[PDB]
């Protein structure tokens, strides 16, 4: 949807005489800003409890940062998405540097591989894999080998002019 932020939203139903201090549910929401995050909070909390935006109240809305934003992590993501003729559960694995960054390439991947837009995807659980050999997918196992090296063949240089005068070279 954008370059994501991760917000915890805490909300409850409004207090009545019979129930003061209600039970205070909490969700971790990936959204672009705090406006969309409080919409996605009531979108899922209406899918789990008898509440809505009118019978409830947003208690706190806080942005969560990656606790180590510069450590490369292997994230296991569980997705519930809607196809053209049904709904499915998926498990994809994403190697990136933050929970923010793994979700932003999750929506780019689900829109490319399966044509799933933001309205069709319920992210169930973004969890980080701590141990190697717990990585289940082979497109992430490629980068966990000891002493990873590879070249980037066929380097194409972007030109600042409309005419080059020598020839292009494609070495690296």
């Amino acid at each position: 949807m954008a370059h994501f932020k991760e917000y915890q939203v805490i909300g409850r139903r409004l207090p009545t005489e019979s129930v003061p201090e209600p039970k205070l549910f909490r969700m971790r929401i990936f959204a672009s800003n705090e406006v969309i995050a409080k919409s996605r909070y009531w979108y899922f909390l209406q899918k789990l409890h008898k509440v809505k935006k009118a019978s409830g109240e947003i208690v706190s809305i806080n942005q969560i940062n990656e606790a180590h934003p510069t450590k490369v992590k292997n994230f296991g993501v569980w997705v519930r998405y809607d196809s053209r003729s049904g709904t499915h559960n998926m498990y994809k694995e994403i190697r990136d540097v933050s929970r923010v960054a793994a979700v932003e390439t999750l929506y780019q991947d689900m829109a490319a591989r399966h044509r799933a837009r933001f309205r069709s995807i319920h992210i169930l659980k973004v969890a980080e894999i701590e141990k190697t050999a717990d990585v289940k997918r082979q497109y992430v196992k490629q980068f966990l080998t000891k002493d990873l090296k590879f070249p980037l063949p066929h380097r194409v240089q972007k030109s600042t002019k409309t005419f080059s005068y020598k020839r292009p070279s494609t070495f690296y």
Binding site: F163, Y165, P168, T170
Partner: protein, 197 residues
């Protein structure tokens, strides 16, 4: 920059080169395209031959001599691809198309001038390596252009003469670099290196 720009067409893709040359014509730059027989089109040879036959059947049903004219030579295939990208029915578009000279092979004068390339049209920089492509010379020969062998002879002759030219020129710049090597370590060379030159 240059008053007349000579573009080496070898290894270039037809539509990207035709687009940049169409804009350069309309902005006032005189362009001559040489070695048009070595253009490329993305996609395999059979695809672009089928495309040429689909073009080759479009003609006026009541008199085919007023129809779409199916020019077969690689220069005129390139020219049709370019003339589609210029508003050719106006005085500005006709004026722009007068600023264009397309040749297959490299004839006189333009075989002693510096040729350029256009990196937003080079097949080695635009296509993914492994995508199959078509050379315009074999396609044109397959659809009825008659002069591939003559262009081959004359281009081999030009390559021999230009190879001898470059051997002489490379010996001359060897002497020039040798004489420039003694000019260093003196006063004016170190002061030039102080001044970035």
């Amino acid at each position: 920059v240059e008053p007349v720009v000579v573009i080496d067409g070898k290894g270039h893709l037809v539509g990207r080169l035709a687009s940049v040359v169409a804009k350069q014509l309309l902005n006032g730059q005189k362009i001559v395209v040489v070695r048009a027989e070595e253009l490329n089109i993305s996609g395999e040879f059979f695809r672009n031959k089928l495309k040429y036959h689909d073009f080759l059947r479009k003609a006026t049903a009541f008199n085919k001599t007023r129809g779409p004219f199916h020019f077969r030579a690689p220069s005129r295939i390139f020219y049709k691809a370019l003339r589609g990208m210029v508003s050719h029915k106006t005085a500005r578009g006709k004026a722009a198309l007068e600023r264009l000279k397309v040749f297959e092979g490299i004839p006189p004068p333009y075989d002693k001038k510096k040729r350029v390339v256009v990196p937003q049209a080079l097949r080695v920089l635009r296509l993914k390596p492994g995508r199959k492509y078509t050379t315009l010379g074999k396609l044109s020969t397959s659809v009825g252009w008659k002069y591939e062998d003559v262009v081959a002879k004359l281009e081999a002759k030009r390559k021999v003469s230009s190879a001898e030219y470059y051997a002489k020129k490379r010996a001359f710049t060897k002497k020039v670099a040798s004489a420039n090597a003694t000019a260093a370590e003196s006063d004016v060379a170190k002061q030039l290196a102080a001044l970035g030159y």
